[PDB]
């Protein structure tokens, strides 16, 4: 019950529905890649070089037409990593850059969301990756990455207020996305708010969540919002003289 007759709530839902939407498409776009039955059965059959072009073209257009800075598609059983331009490497569990698919392969789970290192590129992205799948056995992962840059940007555009900013935050308190980028990824909740204030936001069920702290003498305001499809919470900052405009 606080804020509720304020425009508080329903301006933060309002930007939690806008980056839910933003972030749906390459959850979904990628969720095609890799539920594509036609790419699922060439890794199925042993990744046949004369179709190969073929799967690089189509990896292309799922970029461009849906505005990712790579696609991607690895065979487990090679270890064959492919993006948009082919052939790019070969995956190896005794080398600690590739442990995001083994370690995502191994644990079974249906999706992969993570901030790391474009190996063929040397970029910060956040990647989508998904199971592909024939007959239960795993056959490969395939998704897409995000700039981390472009991402920071756009979650910077959601400031409002003179000083109200906005913050992705995984549910254990990393900060994923935020508004300078130098933080995506690498800053704590409890550096942007205070231990308590972090607390209090990351608490809760899937209501507006809500704490005060405060910085040197100046009175703040946190939210939290869950996202939907995301084990995610949208995070603002206000001071409290900006509660009301
Ligand atoms: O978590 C990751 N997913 C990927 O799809 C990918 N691709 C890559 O080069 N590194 C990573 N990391």
Redesign the pocket.
Same mark, same amino acid.
Do not use: E, M, S, T
């Given at each position: 019950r606080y804020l509720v007759d304020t425009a508080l709530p329903a301006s933060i839902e309002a930007i939690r529905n806008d980056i839910e939407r933003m972030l749906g498409q390459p959850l979904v776009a990628a969720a095609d890649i890799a539920g594509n039955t036609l790419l699922r059965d060439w890794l199925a059959a042993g990744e046949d070089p004369a179709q190969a072009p073929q799967f690089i073209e189509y990896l292309t257009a799922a970029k461009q037409r849906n505005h990712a800075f790579t696609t991607?598609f690895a065979s487990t059983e090679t270890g064959h990593?492919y993006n948009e331009n082919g052939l790019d490497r070969t995956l190896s569990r005794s080398n600690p850059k590739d442990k995001? +698919?083994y370690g995502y392969i191994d644990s079974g789970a249906e999706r992969?969301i993570?901030i @790391?290192? @474009? &190996?063929?590129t040397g970029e910060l992205a956040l +990647?989508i990756?998904y199971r592909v799948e024939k007959e239960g056995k795993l056959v490969g992962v395939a &998704?897409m &990455?995000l700039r981390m840059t472009e991402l920071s940007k756009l979650i910077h555009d959601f400031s409002f207020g003179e000083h109200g900013k906005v913050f992705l935050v995984r549910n254990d308190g990393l900060i994923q996305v935020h508004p300078d980028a130098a933080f995506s990824g690498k800053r704590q909740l409890a550096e942007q708010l205070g231990a308590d204030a972090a607390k209090g936001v990351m608490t809760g069920g899937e209501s507006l969540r809500s704490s005060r702290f405060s910085r040197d003498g100046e009175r703040y305001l946190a939210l939290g919002l869950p996202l939907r499809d995301l084990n995610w919470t949208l995070v603002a900052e206000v001071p409290e003289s900006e509660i009301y405009a």
């Open positions: 991607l990593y995001w +698919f992969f993570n @790391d290192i @474009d &190996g063929a +990647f990756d &998704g &990455g």
